[PDB]
């Protein structure tokens with residue numbers, strides 16, 4: 001269990017200390033979202049080719065959970081259509097609240113964030129980036 005806890009922590013820390021897709025995209029949708037209680041803030045940019053998430057980057061500062069989740073999300077949604085990305089967001093939200101471990105879609109590293117469901121107050125952290133995604137694609141309708 002100690003090694004297993006360390007393995008969960010190492011996946012999350014790999015995404016936190018080696019974040020994927022840091023930065024700001026050219027010619028993109030910009031969404032800002034903040035979690036004032038924990039103090040997490042994310043700026044998600046998304047380059048859409050019509051309804052295709054052609055690219056997605058994020059900048060931010062926050063806890064390990066929120067920034068790791070943003071890294072994993074940007075990596076997971078790249079190349080998907082808006083509809084699929086929103087389905088993935090809903091699947092992840094349900095997985096965070098404990099409703100459905102729907103592995104119909106392979107969420108990869110995102111599933112390590114299931115650990116955070118152990119502490120309910122950090123669920124918001126884990127979902128910050130996904131909320132940004134939804135705000136992003138309700139902006140360009």
Ligand SMILES: [Zn+2]
Nearest residue numbers: 038040063125
């Ligand atoms: Zn946080």
